[PDB]
Write a protein that binds this ligand. Sequence first.
Ligand SMILES: CCCCCCCC/C=C\CCCCCCCC(=O)O
Ligand SMILES: CCCCCCCC/C=C\CCCCCCCC(=O)O
Ligand SMILES: CCCCCCCC/C=C\CCCCCCCC(=O)O
Ligand SMILES: CCCCCCCC/C=C\CCCCCCCC(=O)O
Length: 582
Amino acid sequence: HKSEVAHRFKDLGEENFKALVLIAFAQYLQQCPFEDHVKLVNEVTEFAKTCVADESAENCDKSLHTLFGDKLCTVATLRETYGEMADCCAKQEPERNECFLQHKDDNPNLPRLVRPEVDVMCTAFHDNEETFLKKYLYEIARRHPYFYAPELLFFAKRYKAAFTECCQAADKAACLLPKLDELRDEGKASSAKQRLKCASLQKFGERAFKAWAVARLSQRFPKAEFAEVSKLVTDLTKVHTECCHGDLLECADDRADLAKYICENQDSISSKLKECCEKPLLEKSHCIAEVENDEMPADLPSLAADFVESKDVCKNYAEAKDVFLGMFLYEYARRHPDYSVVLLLRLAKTYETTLEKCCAAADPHECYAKVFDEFKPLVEEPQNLIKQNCELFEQLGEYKFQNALLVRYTKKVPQVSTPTLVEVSRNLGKVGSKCCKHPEAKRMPCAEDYLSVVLNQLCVLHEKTPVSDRVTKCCTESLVNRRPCFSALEVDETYVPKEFNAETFTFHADICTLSEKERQIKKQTALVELVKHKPKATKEQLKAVMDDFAAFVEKCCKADDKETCFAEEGKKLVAASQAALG
Ligand SMILES: CCCCCCCC/C=C\CCCCCCCC(=O)O
Ligand SMILES: CCCCCCCC/C=C\CCCCCCCC(=O)O
Ligand SMILES: CCCCCCCC/C=C\CCCCCCCC(=O)O
Ligand SMILES: CCCCCCCC/C=C\CCCCCCCC(=O)O
């Protein structure tokens, strides 16, 4: 039917097509020059215009993969540069393309991208703003070959809108930097979420994934019927598999097909989809995936009815276990948008466990009559933690809240690197700052969202440089008990204090010229070292030492001649503190 290129070109528009072709090629030819890819893009774009003018034009009939594959193999250096990958050009289609996906190197050997000065950046932006955005688009795409292209394009437009609104302000840095930080964090989270979902699919199986998807979908579309939700879980599962495989083209088609489906049965799924279903092809699925929870019917029976009281349960269960259990989740999840998905799964595993013990006993109904009774504690566990932690967060504020976490975790896993403990504690604080501003009904979902990517990054790291069997236990265990296992970590009684070191607790006046972020990291780094040296110190002994240090920095940063007060009063602080911490 017609021409694929022409079609995609008409749907996307020239501007989007060119930016997407750039990203796609950058993700395969990660080592080729920018000017080389631009040549490529122009060539393909010109070809695509040929097809838009005449569908019968040469090669215009060819499939996207084939056209794409032919273009890659057309690169001169290829073998000289990539070597192995060049041998892919010797194969037929299904093979050739699969051969390229295998050589798509994740975690390249490229330099870190350094953020330029707001001024140089803004000035480059005013000059060729297009080549300014494409170069960076190219730089980020080659470093993240797995990042879904259209999404990367959505972030790029937000960056563009920020340079536009900021490069014209009185104080540019004041405007730009703050939003460049939000975008970075946002981009890293999305990137991590993505690897997280794919790793989970791989590590735990499609069953676990389907369970997660049912719960998640039911919270969002509480009005949808179970048959509808199972339909979506199935398709959603096929989408994640191919999108994880890395094949951009297949992934995009599956996503478009799904969003189209959902939009066509809009009224049969959710009322909060109107906006998203009006958007262009490029942003539909992305919009839908971010859509807000629809409101629940209000005309819903009780869970006790069909799952706890009604005999006919084991019968209905033995008939199709997973389906029955899926029904339980659907029912429980659409009634609880306020629960995290993992909590929902813990309740479902608990219920499964019960049906599996009771349905085989003499009087079934009398064995599982009090099951909802066993849910209470599972539910209270996270709620209580969130309540306790957000109260504390509101008490001391972000920075001081980060310190509280710092002391807490260093004490639980002293074997961890100081820079890693600092990074972890800081990220956790931002979660507290993002999620505690929410009402009690949106807090667990918020925390789950952020905590999962933080806990995963943590584990992949530990997977590389192991440090504690305890961490490994929590990291390799069930994805449903991952967080509870970390919450259960106890202070490390075993650990042996790190012998004193003055260099470690030696401060200089430079901490006064430092920026807010740099001196925090400076102080926090020391705080971790302090706890690693005297792990048996009280929250109070520590508060006292931290207070003595506070005034220290003050009565020395505001003193005539610094680098001395710092060595004089410093010697004192350390000698006195050593005594306090007996
Ligand atoms: C991990 C991918 C998510 C990040 C999205 C990036 C989108 C790229 C679009 C335009 C380039 C912006 C140029 C500014 C670079 C500064 C990057 C940084 O702060 O780390
Ligand atoms: C509102 C979230 C509060 C975030 C504060 C950051 C401190 C992290 C420590 C404990 C938070 C525990 C939250 C547990 C909910 C995750 C979902 C789950 O496991 O059910
Ligand atoms: C040397 C680097 C290797 C990686 C080491 C991993 C370090 C883990 C450090 C701290 C654990 C994070 C705390 C997890 C949140 C649990 C929530 C709670 O407190 O209830
Ligand atoms: C027995 C070991 C003695 C070590 C010497 C102690 C010197 C003090 C060292 C580190 C304190 C770190 C400061 C953390 C509090 C930051 C709070 C704030 O910003 O005001």
